[PDB]
Amino acid sequence: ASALGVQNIGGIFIVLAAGLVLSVFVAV
């Protein structure tokens, strides 16, 4: 079939958001 995200790409955005929050937490 065609291409999607979600199954293994859908958890990498959690890593992106956690990295953004942790980078802000270092930057304080």
Add this chain to the structure above:
Amino acid sequence: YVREKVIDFSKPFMTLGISILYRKPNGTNPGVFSFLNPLSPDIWMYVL
């Protein structure tokens, strides 16, 4: 030959073959949305 055991046949006019018939419509598609066809609009919202 199965029918030939039942009834007689003459010499045939020409040999008749079996071949495949299917039209070829094909078509076109602009790449401005089909180029990003793996990139579903949920992933477009994720990247945005």
